[PDB]
Symmetry: C2
């Protein structure tokens, strides 16, 4: 039939594991897409299909084709670290039975395997562009055989988008030059069903397969009043509630119960965090009321759900009070205020189906995949704005649990004044994807183009204006416009007038400075790099070594609305603040004559010096949070003192750990060797949130800060000690912190016996690799 994979002749290892996953047969569209033509022979490829359509199986089989036959290496580029982690573990399981070696470059993580050892690198767009810049420096690029891009529709919509354009255009510019002046580097792109996907394929010189095939039919609708309208706005049903809900009038609660009785999950998107908490509370209390008054009441796997609650309660943040009542009933909320492990457990319980209503903010839609039968979206308005059509289609695209459901369903709930927006979301379609490099004429030229011109010149490609114009023709801006060359000449002038590059007579040839090479190696933005360089020179002339705060002042990202800074707390903290830390404050320019003003009331903040002073204050306040965070003050206690949420601290912690890496490599390339000593410790130390004491022990990835804390406190101060310890000892010490209540991000929950064995065995593995 050529559809049972055995006909294709895959390695038996992957065949059996796909059968364990369930992929005994590929869909006709996947078979055609691999057959399509020069695709199978190495031509670039772009394809789009619904997320349910088996989207990634095509790229996975092309990776095997290249990696086994060519024995060259592949990149996998993913939009988010949560996706990147999950895909790394999936690919490891399948390929490790082959013996193909997989590890990833994600967030502040770096692999223990050096890239020479790897076959496949799974990475976030930011780390992907950083890798390619290193591959240009080494001139290693010949090593790459494939570059797979997910969420290629990001190309226009974010700061991550322009990095994807600057990434792909360097590979195009270098490869086509080397080829023109079989396909060595193949691109496989996956995207949303963009209008101008024909253009993206033609720009990449890809082959294109667009399909809207889904494994389960999707039924959309909108609900307004009691009426449920099909997308064509014919009435398909008139709703009348099975459940006499008291909590709210939109029937959102009774519209969930309608399918829960059919034993299927609901997923429910809410405009905001506190709304998601309040609505998840109401649904759980109506589940309890029905059961307490008692179609049947809900049937719940309560032994499984208490195992889920135990896995939550052992987290550093414990079990949230709202989750405590809602989770045993089988309702849960998921929003940016939850910690990463806490979300992952809620997500994992929903995939199994132990949770049956999950409410979420829209961030779940673009993130990790969950199948849900009934997807309810409460309003066409989110955050005080119309919902974006990309987000709506990423939400509804989840509907229908493939192979379990006969059909998927979605109900957009809407009011009369909003109905016009609800209709528009159903019938509308995405904007064409559009290069971010288009000149914003109120500036000199867009910072993404200045980065672009920096990356080539400092890279040592297109050292001359004719080559920069040739790279311009590869740029997707050119294919989208097919002013650009005038914008490029302005970028060169800006870089030259800000001493990132030197101009010399031969036309002209442009050379990097140390400041240029440090900017490219760090991956910092160059406009930011001026103030980073100015602040580092201001600090190195009068540094405070008696504490961690001044180092953290340089490491902390600038204020990016990551929380509302409660000035009353800040002025209260300021009086208590130690005089040693007040010395750090007045060195960097914090002044209480202005901090008293912010607690007295809103500052007008309409002038650049008040803007920078406010940024000084707001950067200082953020640096105090990081000082408490790396002293192992629990997340619950930072929240008491500063008032920010658990998820705000963790997202600040992850981004600050990335910025600590940038500042370290920036200072190294400049040659501030003293600063490299101090700051290099802080990337790992911020990433896990630990004292200096633990930084060696945390190398075992099965150990978080708290598990490292107890193994350290027991006396296993080094990986050698932890490898010498008996498994029974680690078990007692882990229990000192016969059922699965340890969470490990790459795994389901471990028992203490199983975790302790793998901890000892990983420590022995680390020593084998470290000594070798």
């Amino acid at each position: 039939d050529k559809l049972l994979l055995a006909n294709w002749g895959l390695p038996k290892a992957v065949l059996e594991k796909y059968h364990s996953f369930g992929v005994k047969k590929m869909f006709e569209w996947q078979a055609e897409c691999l057959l399509l033509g020069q695709v199978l022979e190495g031509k670039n490829l772009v394809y789009s299909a619904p997320t349910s359509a088996g989207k990634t199986l095509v790229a996975e089989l092309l990776i095997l084709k290249r990696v086994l036959e060519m024995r060259k290496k592949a990149l996998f580029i993913l939009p988010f670290v949560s996706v990147a982690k999950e895909k790394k573990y999936y690919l490891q399981s399948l390929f490790q039975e082959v013996g193909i070696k997989v590890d990833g470059y994600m967030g502040s993580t770096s692999p223990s395997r050096h890239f020479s050892s790897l076959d496949i690198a799974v990475c976030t767009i930011e780390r992907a562009n950083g890798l390619i810049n290193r591959l240009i420096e080494e001139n290693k690029m010949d090593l790459l055989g494939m570059v797979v891009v997910d969420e290629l529709h990001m190309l226009g919509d974010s700061h991550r988008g322009y990095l994807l354009e600057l990434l792909l255009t360097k590979i195009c510019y270098i490869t086509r030059k080397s080829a023109s002046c079989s396909n060595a580097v193949q691109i496989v792109g996956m995207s949303a069903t963009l209008p101008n996907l024909e253009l993206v394929a033609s720009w990449l010189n890809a082959e294109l397969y667009h399909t809207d095939f889904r494994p389960v039919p999707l039924l959309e609708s909108v609900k307004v009043g009691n009426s449920i309208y099909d997308s064509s706005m014919k009435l398909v049903r008139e709703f009348e509630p099975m459940l006499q809900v008291k909590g709210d009038e939109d029937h959102v609660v009774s519209l969930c119960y309608e399918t829960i009785c059919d034993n299927h999950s609901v997923l429910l998107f809410c405009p905001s965090k506190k709304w998601c908490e309040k609505l998840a509370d109401i649904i759980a209390r109506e589940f309890y009321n029905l059961h307490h008054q008692a179609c049947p009441p809900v049937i719940l796997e309560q032994k499984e759900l208490l195992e889920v609650m135990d896995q939550l309660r052992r987290l550093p943040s414990g079990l949230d009070s709202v989750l405590q009542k809602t989770v045993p009933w089988g309702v849960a909320f998921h929003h940016a205020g939850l910690t990463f492990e806490e979300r992952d457990i809620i997500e994992g319980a929903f995939r199994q189906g132990l949770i049956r209503v999950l409410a979420a903010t829209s961030t779940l839609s673009s993130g990790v995949n969950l199948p849900a039968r009934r997807v309810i979206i409460r309003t066409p308005i989110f955050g005080g704005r119309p919902l974006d059509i990309l987000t709506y289609k990423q939400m509804v695209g989840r509907a229908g649990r493939k192979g379990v459901d006969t059909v998927g369903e979605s109900i957009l709930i809407c009011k009369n004044s909003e109905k016009s927006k609800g209709i528009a979301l159903l019938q509308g379609s995405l904007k064409p994807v559009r290069s971010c490099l288009q000149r914003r004429e109120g500036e000199e030229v867009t910072g993404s183009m200045i980065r672009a011109i920096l990356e080539i010149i400092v890279g040592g490609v297109a050292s001359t204006s004719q080559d920069m114009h040739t790279y311009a023709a590869c740029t997707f801006l050119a294919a989208s416009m097919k002013v650009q060359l005038g914008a490029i000449e302005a970028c060169v002038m800006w870089l030259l007038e800000n001493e990132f590059i030197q101009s010399t007579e031969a036309g002209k040839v442009y050379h990097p400075t140390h400041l240029g090479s440090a900017t490219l190696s760090s991956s910092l933005s160059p406009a930011d790099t001026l103030d980073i360089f100015a602040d580092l020179q201001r600090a190195m002339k009068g540094f405070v070594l008696e504490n961690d705060l001044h180092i953290l002042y340089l490491v902390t990202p600038m204020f990016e609305d990551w929380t509302t800074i409660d000035w009353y707390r800040f002025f209260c903290l300021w009086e208590k603040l130690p005089t040693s830390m007040k010395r750090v404050a007045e060195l960097v320019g914090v002044e209480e004559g202005f901090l008293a003003r912010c607690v007295k009331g809103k500052v007008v903040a309409r002038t650049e010096r008040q803007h920078r002073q406010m940024a000084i204050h707001k950067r200082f306040f953020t640096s105090l949070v990081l000082l408490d965070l790396i002293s192992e003050v629990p997340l619950r206690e930072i929240n008491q003192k500063y008032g920010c949420n658990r998820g705000q601290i963790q997202s600040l912690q992850q981004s600050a750990a990335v910025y600590a890496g940038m500042i370290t490599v920036f200072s190294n390339r400049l040659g501030w060797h003293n600063m490299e000593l101090l700051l290099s410790q802080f990337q790992k130390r911020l990433t896990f949130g630990i004292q200096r004491e633990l930084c060696d022990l945390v190398r075992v990835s099965l150990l978080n800060a708290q598990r490292a804390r107890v193994l350290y406190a027991s006396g296993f101060h080094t990986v050698a000690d932890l490898a010498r310890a008996n498994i029974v000892e680690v078990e007692v010490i882990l229990k000192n912190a016969n059922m699965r209540t340890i969470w490990v991000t790459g795994r389901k929950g471990l028992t203490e016996r199983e975790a302790a064995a793998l901890i000892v065995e990983e420590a022995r593995m680390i020593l084998q690799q470290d000594l070798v």
Copy 2:
């Protein structure tokens, strides 16, 4: 007879090597000294013999006895690093065929083996006391089986003298306390012919053997005018010069020539460095004039002396212009201005006898064993003072080449007005040794006693006044007085009032602070520790990271007359000094108005304000020298810019590398973890004198800074790559940097091929031990 070592029944591996060293038969006094009684069964021993006796053979046979039968470890304590290096390589060469493991602790040297893996530790006094303090902290002391002390006469007078008393008293106090409430630790003490040696033996509970047996009879006389007088002032000979002179009237050149008429060699001691240069020059001119005008002229085998000159000229210092003319005629000078490798090569050539007249300052006489046949001493008046009788007897004690001569001779040259002093030195005898612990009139307490009470209390022995009085009874001050207890209670009060210890109610019990534990663990002086701790807090509140200078300002030893500071140079440098370095100057407290004053005229500091102000200036000036030395500015260029001699920089460099270790460990115990990062690199960088990148490579002991520079510059950036290296490539590099012209301190000179092979083999050995 059975004085043949084969009758004693030593291990053949040492017996054969002693035969290779000519030690086929022990002297009768050595046989008796080992037989003497309970000495052979583990009783403490003190013994005294002339330096040219077989003095160390007794201690060497007692070491073998303990380390083979008990398998406990031994210490060997020596007064100077040069002796400690020499003795370590001898003991390695002798014992390593037995499998006994030997290494040592000398200045900033630390062994690659941890102490548990040694059998014998060869230590400078200062590092030996530091070891015993660690052995108390670990409570490892049971591991020791023997402690051998040389130069017990140092106990009386040196600034490193009392440190040997504090060392010996702790071993006595702990051993007697634990044994009373076979001899586990045996002391073997070599000593001068002290008057009160019987007291030292009784204090140490030692057996005693004292002899004046010499292997060659000594002749000893004083010369005034043309008359050579015996010790009784009877005339031994009338003197008339065999060789007429022009340089000086005392016939010193003719008195050398009398033995240069034969194959024997003269060692000549001079009261000053520049006098030694001028007198060695004059002797070489008159040797040349004799050969040029021509008893036979000298026979020199100049093929050997050109190899000696080639081994000098390879050194970073080159060949000194005064050595250049003098060395080929077989004359050499030796003084504290020479580089350490220059001294070692000049010493080595004199032992072989290629150099026939060596002129030296007094430092050689105490420093290292050289056989010399006639020893001439040029005045009773060294440095404007009469010689110390210890120094004279050390100078004369060298006379007579064992087994070569029938007699040794020494002549003291003396003028008519001096003659009374010359005879006084010739007839007189050493002072009895004394504790150097009694406080003088107007002192509160001695710093040695404060250190004594600190070391016990913070060590955790004698936490109470009755035990401090019991340790007092062990102190040699008690045996010499047999006020001390009143001085102890004043020391406890001083420590308690300066917060080194805490007082608590039970009598009383005294506890260490962090400051106490840090000052003990660093081995700093406590009075110095106050100003060190005050300066570290003042620096950590306003540090300069943009250069190495501020770190060096904390690391540089306090000014110790190591140079005459040319203030005119200092003011000339100050105007040129970069504004960044001037910022370091203004932070630490340097004032240009006072610096112009020192050029304007001699400044005498009359008050404590001016003493520390001047000390700030002098400490700053010294810190600039270390900054240029750490840049690898060649010693010649430092000498040009700052004025000081090679030997002053190197002795400053060694002492600063010790002090860098003290401040690193001091900052660790206080918990200034940022200061650990900066300062810890500087101990190695100061020791070898290297930029940061070389710090990994120089740990291969055959590799100096210049050899590391050329290997690094070639690309062998790591010891792994140096283990990978092809030996022929190292040969080509070192030749690029035929004959024996490399110098290695533990060896004779090496061929380029032999050094290259051992460099690679050491790198492989380093990897094996490091991985294991």
